[PDB]
Design a protein around this ligand. Structure first.
Ligand SMILES: Nc1nc2c(ncn2[C@@H]2O[C@H](COP(=O)(O)OP(=O)(O)O)[C@@H](O)[C@H]2O)c(=O)[nH]1
Ligand SMILES: [Mg+2]
Ligand SMILES: [Mg+2]
Ligand SMILES: [Mg+2]
Ligand SMILES: [Mg+2]
Ligand SMILES: [Mg+2]
Ligand SMILES: [Mg+2]
Ligand SMILES: [Mg+2]
Ligand SMILES: [Mg+2]
Ligand SMILES: [Mg+2]
Ligand SMILES: [Mg+2]
Ligand SMILES: [Mg+2]
Ligand SMILES: [Mg+2]
Ligand SMILES: [Mg+2]
Ligand SMILES: [Mg+2]
Ligand SMILES: [Mg+2]
Ligand SMILES: [Mg+2]
Ligand SMILES: [Mg+2]
Ligand SMILES: [Mg+2]
Ligand SMILES: [Mg+2]
Lengths: 401, 80, 57, 93, 120
RNA sequence: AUAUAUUUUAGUAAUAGAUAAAAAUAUGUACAGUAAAAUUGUAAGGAAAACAAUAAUAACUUUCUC
RNA sequence: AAACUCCAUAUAUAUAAUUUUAAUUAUAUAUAAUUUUAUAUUAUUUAAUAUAAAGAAAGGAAUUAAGACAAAUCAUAAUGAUCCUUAUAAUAUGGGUAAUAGACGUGCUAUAAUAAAAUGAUAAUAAAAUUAUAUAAAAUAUAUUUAAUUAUAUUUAAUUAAUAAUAUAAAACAUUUUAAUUUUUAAUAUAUUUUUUUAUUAUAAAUAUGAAUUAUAAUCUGAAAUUCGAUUAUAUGAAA
């Protein structure tokens, strides 16, 4: 008893997935570029078209945000938060960050900005938004024999596709291969004719490698090969990113069960192990400017692990595996992860946001009409808990109290 | 003693004399666990009112004696 | 038409019945028939002899 | 009221044509309680059977020659005769 | 659609849960163990199963003491109870509650299905 | 081992004996046989259900044998 | 009757070497209101409405008279009369008070998505009360390959208490999941909705509700758990 047009989903899903961004005012806002941050240092800025294209593919813009409020997802540049982070990324020798903060402070937004910057500066981006998919057991998996770990060839395929599409092909096909690669063919065409697909050293490309389509049991092998290729190449920078890395840290054991009924460890998987290797000084990328940018989510569980990894708490040895996994900490220490605290909004920034919202026509009538502007701003600041952006946004729009 | 450790529930009885010569054992215990040492001994277990004659088979070995002497009469209704 | 119990009874009945379970008749050639007769007669004689031996004893 | 199988018309066996009921029978080996095997013709399809309770292990047929099991299993550490002697005072009865 | 060991299954039915629902011998833990043995990802659906996987499941079910055999064990136990002049056996025979309950009022479920031939 | 085609089987049903005192075609003819009671027993079975058993072989023929 | 009374409230004073700390408290002693004042608007100096300025100022408990109902209690206890005195008095062992056709009250749990379940350790936020016929912390072991959870066992740290324990309150709020529901899944492509979209293929009246009833195994208390107790596990999964 359902039509195509009617809304059948729950609220959060509906807001994400039903395009109510359709009925919205076009806004001629400035464009996000790191080279011209001096112009737009503390102003709202729409992303470039190319950036948007890349960012959507990656999975930067998420469901629980209020990206439905505008024509397209929008951020502002911040001197204390985003700009400083970008500068650190540019300058630091290690280039290896974990974006920490309170729930709703704007970690994902920071990640999205970092991605956009990377896109601008001719870099490949391997984004893993929501590791919950590979960590929790809701897709097929298999123990590979060559690689001593469990591969996940539904998730992997999706990730490969994202990598292919998020990045431009000219940058991606500038990379020649280091080794030759045999794979099992899995086209609808040439199934009987071509039993195997072969990629040569100099002739073939990374783009071509990505476009390969194998059976599930070779997908993990393909992924491994791709990563190796990217590590080897020194022509283009590789930005690796993992958002909701908190889940990964806490969920040490996956929901998958091996032959004997017991839970599989995250490092015994392909994806989680690979990710950990990337984080640590192990799969070292040949080029400079090649970063790993991790991000915590307030959604996920909290425990002693991440604080212990960083310069926060001394290592209590007696706390349990559930609330403190030491292997993960050790791995984090190995690859010198310098954490980045996202600061809460200043008064001026809050004011600027409120002004933008007013321009876009999100503010309620009781806020605008018959009220001093400065007083309103102060109230908004108070209700957000002194500049938590999400909370502020909620107070503005989702209050109706 | 129900729990496997510390069991069974043992009671003093005239067992050896019954074993020698078929003299039924009039139990008023009802909470003594039956043992393998008395299968094929005649017991006369109390019912509240009247002692009930039973010959202990090998299927009874785990159970209590009072489980085989049903105290209440089988219920009926006088359809008036 | 019939219950499962009725069906099972019918099956049981069939087990006992000669309906469509029995082979063709054992036909013989005349020489074969003679051979059979000689086998049977000799056997019968032997059995009689044995009976007499036992009886005599 | 009376449960029946209602008869069809009977098939006329002609005089002389009546054939004896030779039922299908297998030669079946019965191994008794001890290793003594005996062949017997049987209608059920099983070439070999071995028997547990027979005349060859019954006391009536040779005078000259699992609740309990469960109990034994779960009161094994105690080892439960001496125990009988200990728990058998014949004063009270 | 997807038949396995005689029991029919609708598609999109999560395998372990479906197994627990249908087969008499198994609950939650047993179904999970079976899935682990066979190597299905948890929350895999019944429609996703290939034919060899189905056969392997069927084999696993056959190896386990389930369905009619499991039911029979329960029946045998109650028959044994009845055989000895036991209180529990007596209760089973008379269709009253067995587990030391009250029956001045509310003993309707027991009356309905405390038989010697229990399950159905 | 498996696929298709063409067949064959499975409609599962009682008498197997010239049946002989359970019940059923009550008039013809041909062939053959003998009932009942009482008694002694035997799972439920009991005075009363079913099944078993309960007069005599002299002479004769054939067969085997001392 | 009201009032004095108690609890709770506001204020003041006292005391507490601010390690028995919670001073944001506890407890003795006061004071405080059955609130006051003024402007108006209706009805006759007052009384209800409204407005204003002054205040922390707004509840609950106990107390339920006379009579009546020959209301309830001789099973809290006691006493009158009356009856029993080897029994209607006294002790032990077991059984019963838990029986089950129908019926009647009180409750509890349910019949799923403005509602159920997993999870949430720099442990979100309470109060009141108990612990020398005790309260039992941490930690080890088993159920259970990690560990947590829950349940037992092991063994008693601390305190007979503003000091330690019972005891990290729970809803809340947040992520995840949820059949009925082809209102979803997964194979392909697809892309500026990517924890997602579109296209084409295949996905065909009690559940992944409920927890009655029963089977087996363990554990707890006790000397003893059969009639007849309480947990945990693996199955069972009515009715609704
Ligand atoms: N920094 C920043 N954050 C914003 C802006 N606009 C909205 N946000 C909010 O940033 C939030 C993302 O915070 P995040 O740290 O991912 O929350 P978490 O997932 O709970 O950790 C969203 O909820 C947005 O509402 C902006 O212009 N800048
Ligand atoms: Mg996040
Ligand atoms: Mg089941
Ligand atoms: Mg008063
Ligand atoms: Mg203080
Ligand atoms: Mg009065
Ligand atoms: Mg009266
Ligand atoms: Mg009175
Ligand atoms: Mg009196
Ligand atoms: Mg008295
Ligand atoms: Mg007395
Ligand atoms: Mg009562
Ligand atoms: Mg009441
Ligand atoms: Mg519910
Ligand atoms: Mg403890
Ligand atoms: Mg304390
Ligand atoms: Mg808590
Ligand atoms: Mg129903
Ligand atoms: Mg349930
Ligand atoms: Mg429930």
């Amino acid at each position: 008893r359902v039509t195509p047009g009617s809304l059948y989903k729950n609220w959060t899903n509906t807001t994400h997935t039903a395009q109510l961004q359709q009925t919205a005012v076009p806004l001629a806002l400035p464009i996000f570029n790191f080279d011209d941050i001096s112009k737009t240092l503390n102003k709202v800025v729409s992303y470039s078209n190319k950036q948007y294209k890349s960012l959507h593919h990656l999975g930067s813009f998420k469901k629980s945000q209020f990206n439905e409020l505008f024509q397209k997802p929008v951020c502002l540049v911040r001197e204390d938060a985003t700009n400083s982070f970008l500068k650190k990324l540019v300058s630091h020798p290690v280039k290896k960050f974990i974006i920490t903060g309170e729930p709703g402070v704007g970690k994902t937004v920071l990640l999205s900005q970092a991605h956009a910057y990377a896109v601008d500066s001719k870099q490949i981006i391997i984004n893993i938004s929501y590791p919950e998919l590979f960590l929790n057991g809701r897709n097929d998996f298999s123990y590979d024999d060559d690689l001593k770990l469990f591969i996940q060839p539904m998730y992997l395929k999706k990730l490969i596709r994202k990598i292919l599409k998020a990045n431009d092909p000219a940058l991606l096909k500038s990379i020649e291969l280091s080794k030759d690669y045999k794979f099992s063919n899995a086209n609808p065409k040439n199934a009987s004719v071509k039993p195997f697909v072969t990629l040569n050293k100099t002739k073939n490309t990374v783009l071509d490698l990505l476009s390969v389509m194998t059976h599930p049991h070779n997908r993990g092998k393909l992924m491994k090969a791709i990563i190796d290729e990217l590590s080897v190449q020194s022509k283009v920078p590789i930005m690796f990113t993992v958002d909701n890395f908190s889940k990964v840290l806490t969920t040490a054991y996956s929901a998958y069960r091996n032959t004997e009924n017991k839970q599989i460890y995250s490092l015994d998987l392909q994806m989680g192990k690979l990710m950990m290797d990337i984080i640590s000084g192990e799969t070292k990328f040949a080029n400079g400017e090649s970063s790993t940018i991790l991000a915590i989510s307030g959604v996920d569980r909290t425990n002693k692990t991440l604080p212990v990894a960083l310069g926060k708490i001394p290592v209590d040895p007696y706390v349990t595996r559930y609330h403190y996994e030491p292997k993960f900490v050790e791995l984090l220490q190995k690859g010198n992860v310098t954490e980045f605290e996202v600061p809460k909004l200043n008064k001026q920034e809050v004011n600027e946001l409120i002004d933008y919202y007013k321009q876009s026509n999100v503010l309620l009538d009781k806020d605008i009409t018959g009220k001093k502007w400065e007083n309103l701003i102060d109230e908004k600041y108070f209700l957000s808990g002194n500049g938590n952006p999400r909370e502020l946004l909620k107070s503005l729009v989702l209050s109706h109290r | 003693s129900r729990s496997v450790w510390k069991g069974p529930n043992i009671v003093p009885l005239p067992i050896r004399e019954a074993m020698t010569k078929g003299t039924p054992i009039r139990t008023n215990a009802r909470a003594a666990t039956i043992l393998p040492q008395f299968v094929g001994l005649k017991f006369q277990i109390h019912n509240g009112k009247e002692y009930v004659p039973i010959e202990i088979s090998e299927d009874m070995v785990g159970h209590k004696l009072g489980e085989f002497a049903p105290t209440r009469k089988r219920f009926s209704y006088t359809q008036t | 038409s019939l219950s499962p119990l009725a069906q099972r009874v019918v099956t049981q009945l069939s087990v006992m019945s000669a309906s469509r379970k029995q082979p063709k008749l054992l036909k013989l050639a005349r020489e074969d028939l003679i051979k059979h007769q000689t086998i049977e007669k000799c056997w019968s004689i032997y059995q009689q002899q044995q009976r007499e031996r036992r009886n005599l004893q | 009221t009376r449960i029946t199988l209602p008869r069809r018309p009977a098939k006329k066996i002609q005089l002389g044509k009546s054939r004896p009921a030779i039922y299908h029978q297998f030669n079946v080996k019965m191994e008794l309680s001890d290793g003594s095997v005996v062949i017997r013709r049987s209608q059920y399809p099983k070439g070999e059977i071995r028997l547990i309770q027979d005349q060859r292990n019954n006391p009536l047929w040779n005078p000259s020659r699992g609740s309990l099991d469960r109990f034994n299993k779960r009161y094994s550490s105690l080892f439960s005769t001496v125990e009988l002697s200990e728990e058998n005072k014949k004063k009270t009865q | 659609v997807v038949h396995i060991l005689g029991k029919g299954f609708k598609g999109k039915e999560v395998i372990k849960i479906a197994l627990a629902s249908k087969f008499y011998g198994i609950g939650k833990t047993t179904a999970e163990k079976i899935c682990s043995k066979l190597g299905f990802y948890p929350w895999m659906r019944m429609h996703q199963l290939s034919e060899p996987q189905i056969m392997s499941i069927a084999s696993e079910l056959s190896t386990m003491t389930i369905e009619g055999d499991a039911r029979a064990i329960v029946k045998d136990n109650i028959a044994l109870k009845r055989k000895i002049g036991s209180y529990s056996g007596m209760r089973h025979t008379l269709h009253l509650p067995v587990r030391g309950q009250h029956t001045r009022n509310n003993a309707k479920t027991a009356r309905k299905l405390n038989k010697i031939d229990r399950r159905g």
